[PDB]
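Record type: ASSEMBLY
Status: queued
Input:
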Amino acid sequence: TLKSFTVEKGIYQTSNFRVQPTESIVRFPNITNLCPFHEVFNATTFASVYAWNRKRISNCVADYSVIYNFAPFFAFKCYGVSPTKLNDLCFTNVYADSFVIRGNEVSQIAPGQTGNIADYNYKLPDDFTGCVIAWNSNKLDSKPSGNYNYLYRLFRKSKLKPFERDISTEIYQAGNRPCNGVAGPNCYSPLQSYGFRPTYGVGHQPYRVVVLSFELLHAPATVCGPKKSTNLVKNKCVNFNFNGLTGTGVLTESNKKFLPFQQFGRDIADTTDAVRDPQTLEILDITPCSFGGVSVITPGTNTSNQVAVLYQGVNCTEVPVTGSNVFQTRAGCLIGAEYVNNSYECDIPIGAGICASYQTQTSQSIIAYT
Amino acid sequence: MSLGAENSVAYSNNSIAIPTNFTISVTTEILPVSMTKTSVDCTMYICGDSTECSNLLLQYGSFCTQLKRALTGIAVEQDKNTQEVFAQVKQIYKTPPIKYFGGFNFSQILPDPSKPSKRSFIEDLLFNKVTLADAGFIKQYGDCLGDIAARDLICAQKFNGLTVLPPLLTDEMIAQYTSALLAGTITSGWTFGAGAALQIPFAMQMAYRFNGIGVTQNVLYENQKLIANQFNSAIGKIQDSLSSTASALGKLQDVVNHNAQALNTLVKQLSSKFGAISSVLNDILSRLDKVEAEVQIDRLITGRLQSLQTYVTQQLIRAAEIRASANLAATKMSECVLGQSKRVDF
Amino acid sequence: STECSNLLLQYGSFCTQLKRALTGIAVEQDKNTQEVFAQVKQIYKTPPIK
Amino acid sequence: AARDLICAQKFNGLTVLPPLLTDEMIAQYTSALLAGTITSGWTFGAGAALQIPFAMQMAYRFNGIGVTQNVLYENQKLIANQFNSAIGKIQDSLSSTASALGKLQDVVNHNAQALNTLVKQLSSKFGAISSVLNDILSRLDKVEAEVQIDRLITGRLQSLQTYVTQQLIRAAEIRASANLAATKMSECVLGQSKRVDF
Amino acid sequence: IDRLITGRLQSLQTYVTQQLIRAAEIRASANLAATKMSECVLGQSKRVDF
Amino acid sequence: RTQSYTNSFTRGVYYPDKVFRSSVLHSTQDLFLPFFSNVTWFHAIHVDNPALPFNDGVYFASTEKSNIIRGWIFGTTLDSKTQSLLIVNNATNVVIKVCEFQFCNCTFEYVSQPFLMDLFKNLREFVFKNIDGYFKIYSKHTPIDLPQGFSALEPLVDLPIGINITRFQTLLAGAAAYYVGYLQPRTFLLKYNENGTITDAVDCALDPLSETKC
Ligand SMILES: *[C@@H]1O[C@H](CO)[C@@H](O[C@@H]2O[C@H](CO)[C@@H](O)[C@H](O)[C@H]2NC(C)=O)[C@H](O)[C@H]1NC(C)=O
Ligand SMILES: *[C@@H]1O[C@H](CO)[C@@H](O[C@@H]2O[C@H](CO)[C@@H](O)[C@H](O)[C@H]2NC(C)=O)[C@H](O)[C@H]1NC(C)=O
Ligand SMILES: *[C@@H]1O[C@H](CO)[C@@H](O)[C@H](O)[C@H]1NC(C)=O
Ligand SMILES: *[C@@H]1O[C@H](CO)[C@@H](O)[C@H](O)[C@H]1NC(C)=O
Ligand SMILES: *[C@@H]1O[C@H](CO)[C@@H](O)[C@H](O)[C@H]1NC(C)=O
Ligand SMILES: *[C@@H]1O[C@H](CO)[C@@H](O)[C@H](O)[C@H]1NC(C)=O
Ligand SMILES: *[C@@H]1O[C@H](CO)[C@@H](O)[C@H](O)[C@H]1NC(C)=O
Ligand SMILES: *[C@@H]1O[C@H](CO)[C@@H](O)[C@H](O)[C@H]1NC(C)=O
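Status: finished
Output:
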């Protein structure tokens, strides 16, 4: 610590001590159903972009490693979560939005991005936490004579809500002349038709887009991964996994009167204080296990090599471990130095009226005194 | 606002004003000496039981060696500040069992054997009007395991690596030093600060002390009872003023309040995101992959390190102010308790 | 700017510390002037004869 | 037409608060102290004001420094003329020389220069594309402008913290000087001092 | 280069702030030394324990 | 209609989240009912303006002792989607539907005990919010003009309706009285006691004393 080979007489603060965890426990809900992605990715026809299908998937087990075998997509874009860690933590419900778009419009399905399809057809929120999948559909959604199945909206009076669907077709009034259902010179139809040909370039090609949206907890978890649960253990500093909430500490039965809609508990520093167990409805409060400071009390290196250790603030009937002498102090406890009933001047100040010194005993020892 | 009452001195070049009577008064001056000794663990405050965040913290400089060195230099300086102020006497003096000091009472400032803490009555009043928190290691690192439904900020400060060290001199030894100084200055006067103690009757060293202000010593010996009654009445009025008003000790309460709210702000700074996606390292490690969580952990490390540097700089400035006040208190103890001062309004 | 304001509240609570420091400095300067100059109980007046 | 520095530092939230005591109140305090010192001596600093002729007060002052009081009453006119010439000489020295008051002018220059540096730090880019927030908000989308505004926020917050730390250090130095001035007012205006070169 | 510049600027600012605080402490000690030289070498001192 | 005006006092406090907090003072900015605003009475007698503006969240209160107040008809005009809750109080049928047109079996079904369930007059307080396509319901009955005091509201139901709502009406299927107040974005300072219940709050934009307290 001192980066030196000779240590002068006194008390120094070296590295701290921690109580290491013994085992690990994994906790997950009581649901064994399988999530049905087989009616989402392959289908005869997809919904239009102005009328996009929303599928709620909940109360099942989602294996995200079989998504790559269901559609030929080059990448797997995500915001707020990694693609590789989708099987580790778990959520409340997952939402699927499947629709077809053009080649220009792939980039505008993004948070905080405007354009033509993002502000009139489908708007994503700026705090979107989910994944976007896009893939080519040349041999599935194209015809040589022109595929006119899908439609689009391009004129609107105002902007768009995040996650809003517009179905009604009304003739736009772009001028002072009233329309009244007449598509005249100043009135136009709000929906024209997509035209797809196989002779177009790659920037106008069909693209099927599936958007998976997540919700970060705030509710009892219903969709979770294939991680196997483990039986509970108490009064031991262990590593816990409460519905994807990881951490290390000791768990105890508590007496905090949780309301029935409450699951977590926050401290001033916004850390998790108490958790409701998902399998059995009971409360456990999390405490970090024992730690503290280590102080080294020594005389000079040329004098002797005897060392006393002071554990700062620790009532050391709980220390898992160093001589045969243990002395309690208002600053902690002292190991390696014996207590005497005499009184001298203060040589090495420990604290709370206690000092230590290297003195003869008959034969040489480190003693502590008032 | 009003500057004061309007007055005009009737000055003339053949007129003088001379007093015929006096008044003995006892005033009270409050002085801070030491502040709270604190210790900060960087590794557990910044990251906390995290291998990846610790390895990213090692990629920075030797910032935390500097912070720990500065906090240790403050913590030694507080004990030095107490040692210079209170330990100005070589030998612990004791008062005789007979307490007739020429008619002066001296019962409310000399210690009593009934109390186990060996503090006098006015010291008990001074220790009662300051609601002090974080006196040292009160919890002893096991009181927070006994979870209470009303959680206090002390366990939250403890569980983030922000510890408070106890002072070297306990309050029993401070009371013993104060009792030694009082027993020196009652039975001997200013002689115990130069060499050994020189015994002298109290009504004679009081007549010595009237000679230092230009008053002849017959004034005491013809008015001893009136001066003793005035001193006893002033002592009783000081006792009543300390019993009634609790806002007189405002200088010592701010030393507790500043060092409580600084640690409270340092604890509350852990809940900020600092531009990242979350304020919890476990959720960052669980959600993201390695490369993006490196960026998020870097943002949290930079924010928490800047907060720790701000706290350390504020503690350094406050420790400088406390050291200046402690030097003033040591000079006041050396020049006024151990002698008699001719400096005006000192 | 409301975007900079949102990022500033998302950043932290340094600004309350800065405001407290500057307010303490200002109260300290008022105390300095009051301590140096106001050491007399009554506003005396010189006689007209000089 | 030509904007001064006061309006430039006023428009960015850097305001200046008035002192609590106006200059008339400070002048009244010093006038009261002078009147008490002339008509009373040191007796107005202990209890109430005791009137005394000024020749007798200066005789007491000579008895303070170890000179017997018969020196004053035989040399009163010479001492009065020497004091009048000394006051006139210090008046002419204050009128002519302009560099004697370099301590208060340094305080004024330091505060004005610190505020000018804090204002001039708003023109820096700190690695962003522009130093104006409206140009970034009108030239980019949300995602990149969040990064640019974050860079500008970090730079401006670091500059503000540097200014606050410098103000705290200067406040500590000024408080030490004010404590010394209060001690000099208590020990020398309100009574005679036996400390050498104080 | 931007990351290295930010780190080195933070280190330099820490060094300058610590040097300023140490300069204030040394200035206080030098004022005490000048007072002791004026009051004890150039004349006798009546102050106790000075 | 008989629109009568009164005062709201300090009412409409609800839990901003679903986490536990004890002996803390927490500041949240959300869609709240401001302190000392004017809620409007209603006296609908059947022997009725068909437009109540939503204005980004609504606070409902009822002092009736039976099931006269049935449900709510959230939507806009009659041009697209526009149908909503059909709450009835026997044991079940909390059905919410987005059926098209047909004013004056489609998307969702909710089962078990309905929203209004109470037996010394009771004041049922409801908060209806719709943020970013998420539709949220708060409900609490209090045994008791509006009384003075604090009583919090608990969350019940979140929904992915995803529609734009600007017009509503209660279902009265004769005398009735229901309080309607409007929510605005405001910041509070909620006080949590030792048991995790809100007992006092301060609106940070009412008067400068509350601004100082915040
Ligand atoms: C000087 O002042 C003291 C008060 O500080 C006077 O003492 C009081 O005298 C009156 C006269 O009857 C008594 O009633 C009081 O009880 C005395 N106060 C005490 C003893 O504390 C004293 O008389 C004055 N001397 C004079 C006027 O020569
Ligand atoms: C000295 O002061 C003490 C106060 O500590 C006086 O003791 C009190 O005297 C009153 C009589 O008016 C009693 O009512 C109190 O109970 C006493 N308090 C005690 C004994 O703690 C004492 O009278 C004063 N004088 C002397 C000569 O000792
Ligand atoms: C919930 O978990 C327990 C524990 O294994 C099990 O006995 C029970 O059948 C589960 N409930 C359901 C509905 O599967
Ligand atoms: C979709 O389902 C069909 C029939 O069930 C199957 O042949 C096909 O492989 C599946 N996947 C794709 C990508 O079409
Ligand atoms: C330390 O632990 C023991 C055993 O639980 C207990 O009796 C004691 O009060 C504790 N505290 C101290 C200061 O010894
Ligand atoms: C509510 O009624 C009117 C608004 O039309 C308003 O002027 C009045 O002050 C309000 N009454 C209150 C707040 O008690
Ligand atoms: C909701 O509808 C109204 C009128 O139909 C429209 O003006 C408004 O922009 C829409 N969106 C909102 C309030 O977000
Ligand atoms: C918390 O609950 C206990 C349990 O009876 C009760 O005694 C106490 O009054 C409650 N506190 C509050 C503030 O309601």
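Annotation: Chains E and A do not touch (no CB pair under 8 Å).
Annotation: The pocket of 2-acetamido-2-deoxy-beta-D-glucopyranose (ligand 7) is lined by residues A 158, 161; F 76, 164, 166 (CB under 6 Å).
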